[PDB]
Design a binder for this molecule. Structure first.
Ligand SMILES: O=[N+]([O-])c1ccc2nn[nH]c2c1
Length: 304
């Protein structure tokens, strides 16, 4: 049927992409590769770029999984996003146990530089820092904050910019879906401050793991995120419990409404492959058929 690719359609509305998280296992099973080829314009590593996947012991990197994704995307004419370079998730014990500031700075910089160098010029977007905020808006006391202090964030970004000046560098977080929530306000205020200091934060990414009914709030939250003045914002990790068309369409329209929002990435293709499968929160069902939300996004994006 005509005009059924949400990536094609969103590009026709002036956005950069509709993306999806994937990896080698997905691409070689199910109908994921077919759907991604037809319907999506950008891919991200669901897991293969995580620190645990990529640097399981100090200085010793594992690239096979990430290489597969990058190669597949290149072969299929897809943009690539990657991350997360610095966050509290998926950290090897060898990182978490470091207590010396200069050591951890250099570990972090080597992790950033190594990964970004390997894929230099190939990656549109890097999520450099993730999940840096507490729910109250204070900085999360992860190993980086505890050992390095708050400079870890400027250092990460500056390191990333040096490693691959072509990439757009993002900070990302979750629970940025309500404009009145302290975390949402805080990331804006801190990103403004960091950018005023010359930190090269090109984007804020909103990890939109949503419960039912939360789409509507994003119409206010996304404009708020864009007010930090980054050149870009994006929607990441999108899924919605229940997959209501109302929620999905509100999210998409938030993207359309926000000039600086470049695109939307969904957390996966088909429901059974979600970490939240019982909430059937994705755009394709367990037989790989598009769900009502997919079709509602198509109608919303269709336009002489
Ligand atoms: O948007 N994404 O779905 C997504 C998935 C994994 C990631 N790791 N870093 N950034 C990511 C974005």
């Amino acid at each position: 049927e005509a005009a059924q690719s949400i990536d094609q359609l969103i590009k026709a509305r002036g956005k950069v992409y509709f993306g999806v998280a994937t990896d080698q296992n997905r691409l070689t099973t199910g109908k994921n590769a077919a759907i991604i080829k037809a319907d999506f314009g950008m891919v991200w590593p669901e897991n293969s770029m995580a620190w645990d996947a990529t640097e399981p012991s100090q200085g010793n990197f594992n690239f096979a999984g990430a290489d597969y994704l990058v190669n597949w995307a290149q072969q299929n004419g897809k943009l690539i996003g990657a991350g997360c370079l610095v966050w509290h998730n998926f950290l090897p014990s060898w990182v978490s146990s470091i207590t010396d500031k200069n050591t951890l700075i250099n570990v972090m910089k080597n992790h950033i530089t190594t990964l970004m160098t390997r894929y230099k010029g190939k990656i549109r977007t890097w999520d450099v820092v993730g999940e840096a905020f507490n729910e109250d808006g204070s900085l999360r006391q992860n190993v980086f904050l505890n050992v390095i202090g708050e400079d870890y964030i400027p250092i990460a970004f500056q390191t990333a910019r040096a490693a691959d000046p072509n990439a757009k560098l993002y900070i990302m977080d979750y629970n940025l879906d309500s404009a009145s929530y302290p975390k949402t306000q805080a990331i804006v205020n801190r990103v403004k401050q960091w950018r005023a200091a010359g930190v090269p934060i090109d984007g804020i990414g909103s990890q939109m793991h949503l419960s039912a009914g939360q789409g509507a709030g994003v119409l206010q939250a996304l404009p708020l995120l864009a007010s930090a003045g980054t050149p870009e914002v994006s929607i990441l990790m999108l899924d919605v419990a229940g997959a209501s068309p109302t929620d999905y369409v509100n999210v998409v329209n938030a993207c359309l409404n926000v000039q600086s929002c470049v695109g939307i990435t969904v957390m996966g293709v088909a429901d059974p492959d979600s970490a939240f499968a019982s909430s059937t929160p994705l755009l394709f069902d367990g037989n790989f058929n598009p769900k009502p939300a997919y079709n509602a996004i198509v109608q919303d994006l269709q336009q002489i």
